[PDB]
Nucleic acid binder design. Structure first.
Ligand SMILES: *OP(=O)(O)OC[C@H]1O[C@@H](n2cnc3c(N)ncnc32)[C@H](O)[C@@H]1O
Ligand SMILES: [Zn+2]
Length: 586
DNA sequence: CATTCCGATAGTGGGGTCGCAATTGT
DNA sequence: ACAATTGCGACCC
DNA sequence: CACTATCGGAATG
């Protein structure tokens, strides 16, 4: 309610104060994640009132600004994923889905783009002025990388054409072309520097640098592919049309973007790009096919993790060979026992591969895999290690059978492989230390209670030393007790207590998900949350009423019902609430 | 309607690099 | 008593 | 980030 001038000055005062403490204490940086935040808030208010900007304002920073801790930025519009298709048939299925859905909106035109291989970045432009830039994070909240993005030559600090909207969030890929990647490695080996493994991870590392001066020396570039929040302007209903407009604003846009009228045209485009792939000058992992019309785009809507109007049409992945040195079994929070191949380290498409999931016992039999076997490996989708097949012809004289454990490798309990099901799991329950660990690990994960600083190691030790038994115990911990832990310390322990405290404020959906109810993942957690609104109506629901919730049948209904039916869980929840955990009432 | 098909999730798995701070070295 | 290493978790794909 | 099993619900005969 306080006037503009009074708001500007209160932001500048806090900013100039942080800079003061920085110099005084002779600090290495500004440990306050609230310095980058305040700065973007000042920029947002300033671009809004270009006449209320002073030459003394921190926004007119004359030279290198003081280093500051990374802050976060919320995405009004989610930065989701893409459903993948790997072959012409997979695409035709996608095409059928889009068609069968739409009601005689017949004219479906496909906008086709290269799927660049770097990292996603969202850039907010207010009245044509670049105010902030953020990564994707969990889709809702991402890291503020404004300082690093400002050093990217290809990204204009201000747009220029006509009808520039009041608010325009530009989404695209930041990346290192091959020549830039090689230039950086040539410099690393010349000096004592460390060389990067590939351009994707090098580009990402560059944007996580605390000191922008270092980022400025990385020849990062950018390409627009979409839009986030949009307010004002006169943008067209065609996706291509919009990119064409961005290009006119001065934003960088790939000249390869094309329009296809049929599925055959899309396929032709796919093979065309596959052929010129080596002449691009940068890496790609495929092409993105999307409904060009923003209207139809809205009719198709999104699913949990991705739009229904687009797919990433990926290229086949580069294969390599190596051998299995061993197969280990890891226990998950729901008791699941997953086999993992330990491989002889081999380089594949830019990275060192040492491990690959084997999924389950059926997969191991399908492959006929034995310890010692030679295998064909590949980074599926150009990211994840996958064991394609065993090379029988080269099976060593001496190989060892892979024996699925009949007793959990942790608590020793019996393993259960239910009739007709493929998954085998540990039956120890609360007795199993691996389940306890994985469960607490899941409770603390980014899409759950999001407790920064709590990882596999700290959790392992807390469960090992019997300090924690249930989620509630996590908040009873004090700096004193944490300080005396392996790889733990005074400030380190304080950061955890702080993160735990901050984690108290959540949402019903995240809390529900954090509880780890069988078959209740993030999507179902949100559905149940939105349906009942309160933890009361939920645990008071019957199996028959639970089945009224969309996408919830008897399996889920029963698991949910049996979960709250247990006093055990009732007190875990009640204790968490007692501990302080809470969320916005509907 | 009984089966089969399929869209959408759940659950569990991988590697690179950087900042912070625990830990080791001068 | 700082300075240089390096374990761990964040957080990219 | 990818894969597979599984669940819920739509499609098939
Ligand atoms: O499945 P996923 O999470 O890897 O995919 C989402 C990411 O795909 C990238 N990308 C690259 N090119 C495009 C185009 N042209 N359109 C939409 N997305 C694109 C993004 O970086 C995104 O996060
Ligand atoms: Zn066990």
């Amino acid at each position: 309610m306080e006037s503009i001038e009074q708001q500007l000055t209160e932001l500048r005062t806090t900013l100039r104060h942080h800079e003061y403490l920085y110099h005084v204490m002779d600090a290495p940086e500004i440990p306050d994640a609230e310095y980058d935040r305040l700065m973007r808030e000042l920029r947002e208010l300033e671009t809004k009132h270009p006449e209320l900007i002073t030459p003394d304002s921190p926004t007119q920073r004359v030279g290198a600004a003081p280093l500051a801790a990374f802050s976060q930025i919320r995405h009004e519009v989610p930065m989701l994923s893409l459903d993948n298709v790997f072959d012409e048939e997979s695409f035709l299925a996608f095409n059928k889905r889009v068609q069968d859905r739409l009601k005689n909106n017949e004219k479906v035109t496909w906008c086709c783009e290269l799927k660049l291989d770097g990292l996603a970045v969202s850039i907010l432009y207010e009245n044509g002025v670049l105010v902030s830039a953020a990564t994707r994070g969990d889709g809702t909240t991402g890291e503020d990388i404004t300082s690093n993005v400002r050093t990217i030559r290809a990204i204009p600090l201000k747009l220029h054409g006509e009808n520039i909207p009041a608010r325009l969030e530009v989404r695209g890929e930041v990346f290192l072309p091959q020549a830039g990647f090689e230039k950086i490695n040539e410099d690393a080996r010349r000096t004592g520097g460390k060389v990067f493994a590939n351009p994707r991870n090098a580009a990402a590392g560059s944007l996580r640098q605390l000191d922008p001066r270092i980022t400025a020396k990385r020849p990062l570039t950018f390409f627009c592919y979409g839009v986030g929040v949009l307010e004002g302007g006169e943008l067209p209903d065609t996706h291509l049309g919009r990119l064409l407009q961005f290009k006119k604003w001065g934003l960088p846009v790939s000249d390869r973007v094309t329009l296809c009228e049929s599925a055959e045209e899309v396929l032709a485009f796919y093979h065309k790009v596959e052929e010129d792939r080596p002449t691009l000058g940068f890496d790609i992992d495929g092409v993105v096919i999307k409904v060009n019309s923003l209207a139809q785009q809205e009719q198709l809507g999104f699913v949990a993790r991705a739009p229904r109007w687009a797919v990433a049409f990926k290229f086949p992945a580069q294969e390599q060979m190596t051998f299995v040195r061993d197969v280990e079994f890891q226990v998950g929070r729901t008791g699941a026992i997953t086999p993992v191949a330990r491989l002889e380290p081999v380089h594949v498409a830019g990275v060192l591969v040492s491990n690959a999931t084997l999924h389950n016992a059926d997969e191991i039999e399908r492959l006929g895999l034995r310890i010692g076997d030679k295998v064909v490996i590949r980074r599926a989708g150009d990211v994840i290690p996958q064991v394609v097949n065993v090379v029988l012809s080269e099976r060593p004289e001496d190989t060892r059978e892979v024996v699925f454990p009949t007793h959990c490798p942790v608590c020793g309990s019996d393993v259960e492989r239910v009739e007709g099901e493929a998954v085998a799991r540990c039956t120890g329950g609360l007795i199993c230390g691996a389940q306890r660990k994985e469960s607490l690990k899941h409770f603390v994960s980014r899409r759950a209670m999001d407790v920064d600083g709590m990882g596999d190691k700290i959790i392992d030790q807390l469960v090992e030393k019997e300090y924690v038994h249930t989620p509630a115990d996590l908040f009873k911990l004090t700096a004193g007790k944490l300080t005396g832990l392996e790889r733990m310390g005074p400030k380190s322990a304080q950061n955890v207590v702080n993160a735990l405290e901050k984690a108290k404020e959540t949402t019903f959906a995240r809390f529900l998900y954090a509880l780890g109810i069988r078959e209740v993942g993030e999507a179902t957690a949100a559905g149940l949350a939105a349906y009942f609104g309160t933890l009361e109506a939920l645990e008071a629901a019957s199996i028959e009423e639970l089945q009224k919730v969309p996408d919830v049948g008897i399996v889920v209904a029963s698991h949910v019902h049996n979960f709250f039916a247990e006093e055990s869980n009732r007190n875990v929840i009640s204790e968490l609430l007692a501990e302080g955990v809470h969320w916005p009432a509907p």
